[PDB]
């Protein structure tokens, strides 16, 4: 992916800074499952946008520098 820098929405930065400016209520409703789970996202509920619903994931650490929607399966039925 990226090499000199790292991709994440700028709106994710700017909206981290706000819900950090209050330590406010839960839910981040990203309408783009792209944007890396870059360090400063702590571990809050991510209702990432699938195409169907809003997959809500409680982030940990074992996932930091690796994409958000990289955690939503979307493709139903496995084997």
């Amino acid at each position: 992916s990226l090499k000199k820098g790292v991709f994440v929405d700028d709106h994710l930065l700017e909206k981290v800074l706000e819900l950090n400016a209050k330590g406010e209520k839960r839910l981040i409703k990203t309408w783009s499952r792209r944007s890396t789970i870059v360090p400063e996202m702590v571990g809050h509920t991510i209702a990432v946008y699938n195409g169907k619903q809003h997959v809500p994931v409680y982030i940990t650490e074992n996932m930091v520098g690796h994409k958000l929607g990289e955690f939503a399966p979307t493709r139903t039925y496995r084997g």
């Binding site: 994931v57 409680y58 982030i59 940990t60 074992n62 496995r78």
Partner: peptide, 17 residues
């Protein structure tokens, strides 16, 4: 960790795929 929340990598690695 690939079972931690089951990242798609480890999701499928769990799926045996």
């Amino acid at each position: 960790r690939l079972m931690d929340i089951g990242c798609y990598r480890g999701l499928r690695h769990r799926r045996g795929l």
